[PDB]
């Protein structure tokens with residue numbers, strides 16, 4: 001038979017290893033030390049948040065195209081101020097009637113915010129790598145002037161940009177006698193005017209102030225104030241101040257300069273928070289802030305987690321005693337064989353240049369320990385329970401006791417390694433390396449404890465020469481087994497577990513898919529207050545870019561008519577569809593309509609002294625800008641007296657680069673480089689390669705909102721690209737896709753549910769087939785522990801839905817490690833039933849419960865409890881939610897099915913009594 005060959009081979013190998021104890025022990029730990037010595041050579045940790053995105057997916061290929069053709073998305077540094085204990089007040093405007101003002105909108109707070117903003121603009125950091133102070137101008141994102149980049153050209157959005165950050169303009173006052181009403185027009189009137197019409201160059205009040213920021217572009221009200229509802233901007237309860245910086249690829253030396261400045265920004269806002277405790281209530285965030293708040297507690301929690309090894313050392317050599325009136329070296333050997341394998345499997349990957357993560361250094365050594373000492377108890381308890389035959393050496397006895405139990409050990413370890421390796425097909429790189437390291441650690445643990453631990457046990461066995469049945473074996477399990485096999489409980493348990501399975505089957509349909517970003521940070525984190533204020537007070541989400549890939553013409557009148565929204569444009573166009581989709585912002589997750597450069601280019605070509613050509617001179621026809629008050633510019637770019645003015649193909653190639661460099665002013669606010677300078681890529685001749693259109697999501701709170709917004713945006717872009725291909729001239733493969741800064745993270749949840757069912761169902765096939773081959777499990781009890789594993793998975797999914805654990809890529813690998821761990825709870829009990837010889841099924845189930853049930857409870861259920869309970873106090877919600885709540889719920893469910901349900905079900909439909917003398 002296939003079973004008896006393997007057991008007959010393991011009996012020879014163990015008795016050979018026990019005859020050379022010192023040689024096999026020293027010769028095995030040498031490769032373990034050689035593998036674990038690579039923890040210093042190329043041990044590198046991948047700190048960014050690109051450990052959470054598949055690099056060969058569609059969402060990362062769209063990011064590569066947008067980064068190639070337009071440059072990467074800018075970094076963000078935000079502060080959200082609130083005045084909690086300030087009362088609102090009434091104010092009567094000269095143009096808007098009575099209007100109530102919130103407590104935050106006051107001069108006494110706006111002046112303090114102006115002082116803080118002007119101090120942040122002059123910050124400087126001493127760069128160690130490049131010997132020079134880093135100023136804000138060198139790394140700020142300036143849309144209107146990227147070449148010179150003076151200190152006042154940086155993009156800084158706030159409410160004080162309406163007044164251009166001038167303290168004298170903020171305190172300005174005028175007396176307007178409108179309609180026979182002498183009313184003091186103040187800054188609040190100008191703020192009310194700029195909130196309704198942000199693209200204003202002269203205010204429509206008595207004080208004729210401007211309305212646009214000092215860097216040139218107009219600022220919209222949803223980037224300055226927040227917390228309103230509708231269009232009453234005077235009731236705003238929050239103030240926003242955003243600093244945006246240039247983003248570079250990771251190899252660039254400017255990235256270290258840009259991240260160096262944000263540390264000084266965070267220190268300055270911490271000083272502002274401490275200095276203004278009784279006036280404001282600030283919450284802040286830098287672009288580097290989420291990257292270092294995630295892996296901040298990796299080196300802080302390891303010494304707390306290292307006491308699990310001491311507890312598992314103390315648990316062995318107290319439950320393995322022969323206490324009459326201690327096996328302390330066996331516990332040290334069990335700890336060293338588990339500790340050696342983890343360091344060897346972790347350091348082998350460092351040689352190959354595979355970068356580790358935070359989860360590898362936090363759950364790997366305390367999850368391998370929970371399934372690494374599992375075979376040690378099953379070997380040592382079988383060594384002491386098998387009595388020595390008369391006149392035989394200790395080596396043959398150790399070989400016989402090893403050969404009787406080791407195929408179940410090989411089956412459990414190989415099922416563990418198969419489930420970890422098969423579960424490493426997830427696209428996310430943080431979970432792939434964790435599964436690969438856990439699989440290699442489990443395989444090295446199985447090799448180490450079958451070659452070195454047997455030699456250590458043979459060495460310890462000799463020692464007892466120089467220097468009752470216990471209590472757990474017979475004094476409890478011979479007074480619990482009649483309880484469980486009483487004929488009233490034997491029917492009650494059989495329907496109670498069935499009702500539990502049915503209730504979990506109903507309750508697993510209320511599960512939620514997706515991992516919130518609030519559940520990744522430590523509990524005493526400052527970013528949680530920022531995420532609370534962001535979800536409560538903002539009125540728009542992240543920006544959306546509807547990128548158009550190369551292939552569209554853009555130069556024909558048939559091409560422009562499918563994009564524009566003005567007069568003489570086709571119905572259901574690009575901008576028309578994006579305009580329509582924001583009228584129902586619950587189906588489509590858009591809040592602001594798309595701003596199209598083609599419409600502003602068509603409006604800019606209308607002859608209103610905004611595009612003019614020289615009549616004659618030294619410069620005949622090159623360009624007359626808007627800032628020229630001369631008599632030689634009486635010639636429009638386009639002609640006059642047509643409806644739906646569309647430029648020719650020659651005129652489109654000529655007038656377009658002048659439009660994308662024109663700076664808006666009082667005599668020409670029609671458009672230019674304030675918004676569309678970086679939204680269009682031009683070729684060498686002047687042909688448009690690719691463009692992009694800007695729109696804003698609605699506020700996305702949870703992680704399902706991000707997935708629904710991404711799916712709705714991709715569906716709307718699919719409708720737009722379907723309609724755009726019918727225009728004559730555009731070639732196939734032209735597509736319009738929506739690009740957002742957070743689509744790489746949340747694109748996995750579109751199709752993680754079919755991926756989870758396939759990968760989980762693919763692990764049951766090499767758990768039942770291999771169990772029927774390495775063991776004597778033929779067919780009746782072969783598909784019974786599979787039923788136990790399916791019940792364990794369904795009950796775990798139901799309780800995971802009930803507790804409030806979302807189903808994501810982190811929890812999916814824990815379920816795959818549970819299907820490889822539940823074989824350990826049921827294969828030992830089922831195999832002991834199969835080799836039983838008793839008259840009736842009830843006594844066979846009683847013998848199976850007494851013999852291996854006590855060993856399974858004392859070495860498989862109490863061995864992983866120190867390794868799992870230590871993670872419950874872990875400082876990070878991801879480790880404390882997915883690797884503690886899930887694993888604790890699997891060990892209790894796995895113990896409760898493999899020790900109360902499997903013996904009861906085996907006394908009804910168990911396999912027949914084979915003689916089995918071979």
Ligand SMILES: *[C@@H]1O[C@H](CO)[C@@H](O[C@@H]2O[C@H](CO)[C@@H](O[C@@H]3O[C@H](CO)[C@@H](O)[C@H](O)[C@H]3NC(C)=O)[C@H](O)[C@H]2NC(C)=O)[C@H](O)[C@H]1NC(C)=O
Pocket residue numbers: 068069070071681682689
């Ligand atoms: C409009 O699109 C153009 C075409 O993509 C952009 O020009 C591209 O800029 C890329 C970055 O400079 C180039 O990639 C580089 O290619 C060289 C040569 O192979 C490599 O050594 C570099 O490593 C590689 N850059 C990286 C970091 O991958 C493209 O080759 C280049 N393509 C063309 C046609 O010139 C324009 O940048 C874009 N317009 C603007 C101003 O953004």
Ligand SMILES: *[C@@H]1O[C@H](CO)[C@@H](O[C@@H]2O[C@H](CO)[C@@H](O[C@@H]3O[C@H](CO)[C@@H](O)[C@H](O)[C@H]3NC(C)=O)[C@H](O)[C@H]2NC(C)=O)[C@H](O)[C@H]1NC(C)=O
Pocket residue numbers: 553554555556649650729
């Ligand atoms: C975007 O659409 C434009 C309008 O459909 C295209 O412009 C057309 O390009 C044609 C060449 O491919 C021009 O044909 C030439 O015109 C001259 C002068 O009238 C004639 O001799 C011929 O018809 C032809 N050249 C030859 C063979 O001598 C069209 O005149 C021109 N149409 C317009 C309105 O100007 C663009 O080509 C298209 N852009 C792209 C991406 O190709």
Ligand SMILES: CCCCCCCCCCCCO[C@@H]1O[C@H](CO)[C@@H](O[C@H]2O[C@H](CO)[C@@H](O)[C@H](O)[C@H]2O)[C@H](O)[C@H]1O
Pocket residue numbers: 049051052075076078290294359430517520534541542543741742745878
């Ligand atoms: C293995 C576990 C570790 C991996 C888990 C990773 C969790 C998910 C990581 C999300 C990372 C990106 O996180 C996202 O960053 C952007 C940076 O623009 C923030 O967005 C910020 O900038 C945009 C645009 O400038 C503003 O509109 C926004 O209000 C502001 O918060 C998002 O609010 C944040 O959600």
Ligand SMILES: *[C@@H]1O[C@H](CO)[C@@H](O[C@@H]2O[C@H](CO)[C@@H](O)[C@H](O)[C@H]2NC(C)=O)[C@H](O)[C@H]1NC(C)=O
Pocket residue numbers: 166167168169
């Ligand atoms: C802030 O605004 C004030 C007032 O507009 C600016 O001061 C003016 O400067 C011009 C140019 O020299 C003078 O002609 C005006 O008479 C000044 N007005 C007053 C009342 O002082 C001031 O320059 C602005 N500050 C900045 C930094 O732009």
Ligand SMILES: CC(C)CCC[C@@H](C)[C@H]1CC[C@H]2[C@@H]3CC=C4C[C@@H](O)CC[C@]4(C)[C@H]3CC[C@]12C
Pocket residue numbers: 024027028031447448451
């Ligand atoms: C053929 C002659 C030389 C007899 C001696 C052969 C012995 C010394 C060789 C043959 C197979 C070898 C074993 C093969 C596998 C392992 C697992 C590894 O993780 C530790 C070393 C260990 C345990 C080797 C020890 C040395 C070994 C036992």
Ligand SMILES: CC(C)CCC[C@@H](C)[C@H]1CC[C@H]2[C@@H]3CC=C4C[C@@H](O)CC[C@]4(C)[C@H]3CC[C@]12C
Pocket residue numbers: 039043044045299302306309342343346361365
């Ligand atoms: C009982 C537990 C801690 C056993 C695990 C020990 C090893 C595998 C763990 C514990 C502490 C960890 C180290 C903590 C800090 C660093 C510094 C970093 O720049 C490189 C990785 C490195 C060197 C880690 C490597 C892995 C590590 C050495």
Ligand SMILES: CC(C)CCC[C@@H](C)[C@H]1CC[C@H]2[C@@H]3CC=C4C[C@@H](O)CC[C@]4(C)[C@H]3CC[C@]12C
Pocket residue numbers: 421422424425
């Ligand atoms: C980094 C990327 C781009 C390269 C490919 C990495 C992944 C997909 C590759 C590299 C090594 C591969 C693994 C190599 C070994 C095994 C064990 C086998 O029993 C199942 C497949 C499995 C688990 C492979 C899965 C796919 C795998 C993990």
Ligand SMILES: CC(C)CCC[C@@H](C)[C@H]1CC[C@H]2[C@@H]3CC=C4C[C@@H](O)CC[C@]4(C)[C@H]3CC[C@]12C
Pocket residue numbers: 799802803888889892893
């Ligand atoms: C079935 C086995 C594992 C027995 C243990 C089940 C226990 C640990 C599980 C099952 C149901 C769970 C509870 C379900 C509901 C809540 C409400 C929540 O706001 C706090 C946690 C709490 C109170 C859970 C605590 C843990 C819990 C009690």
Ligand SMILES: *[C@@H]1O[C@H](CO)[C@@H](O)[C@H](O)[C@H]1NC(C)=O
Pocket residue numbers: 098099100
């Ligand atoms: C402003 O708020 C107060 C709160 O009571 C409300 O009574 C008042 O009517 C509001 N002002 C206007 C113009 O409605």
Ligand SMILES: *[C@@H]1O[C@H](CO)[C@@H](O)[C@H](O)[C@H]1NC(C)=O
Pocket residue numbers: 124131132133
């Ligand atoms: C700027 O750099 C110079 C030379 O390194 C240094 O003396 C000066 O102190 C730096 N500026 C600040 C703000 O310290």
Ligand SMILES: *[C@@H]1O[C@H](CO)[C@@H](O)[C@H](O)[C@H]1NC(C)=O
Pocket residue numbers: 147148149
């Ligand atoms: C930008 O501006 C400064 C000051 O006008 C000028 O001297 C410098 O040459 C310019 N540099 C670039 C790269 O545009």
Ligand SMILES: *[C@@H]1O[C@H](CO)[C@@H](O)[C@H](O)[C@H]1NC(C)=O
Pocket residue numbers: 173174175182184
């Ligand atoms: C008009 O307003 C000014 C400044 O606000 C004030 O000083 C002056 O008294 C007012 N003039 C009249 C005629 O009331």
Ligand SMILES: *[C@@H]1O[C@H](CO)[C@@H](O)[C@H](O)[C@H]1NC(C)=O
Pocket residue numbers: 084085277278279280281
């Ligand atoms: C606002 O005032 C209340 C009442 O005095 C006080 O309890 C609270 O701490 C104050 N908050 C801040 C941020 O000053």
Ligand SMILES: *[C@@H]1O[C@H](CO)[C@@H](O)[C@H](O)[C@H]1NC(C)=O
Pocket residue numbers: 571
């Ligand atoms: C939609 O198209 C039709 C036919 O091209 C046109 O008559 C109508 O004016 C367009 N838009 C509407 C419905 O106003």
Ligand SMILES: *[C@@H]1O[C@H](CO)[C@@H](O)[C@H](O)[C@H]1NC(C)=O
Pocket residue numbers: 588712715716717718719
């Ligand atoms: C595109 O597909 C259908 C057909 O035009 C349309 O009903 C649907 O509303 C469009 N998609 C979106 C996101 O509106």
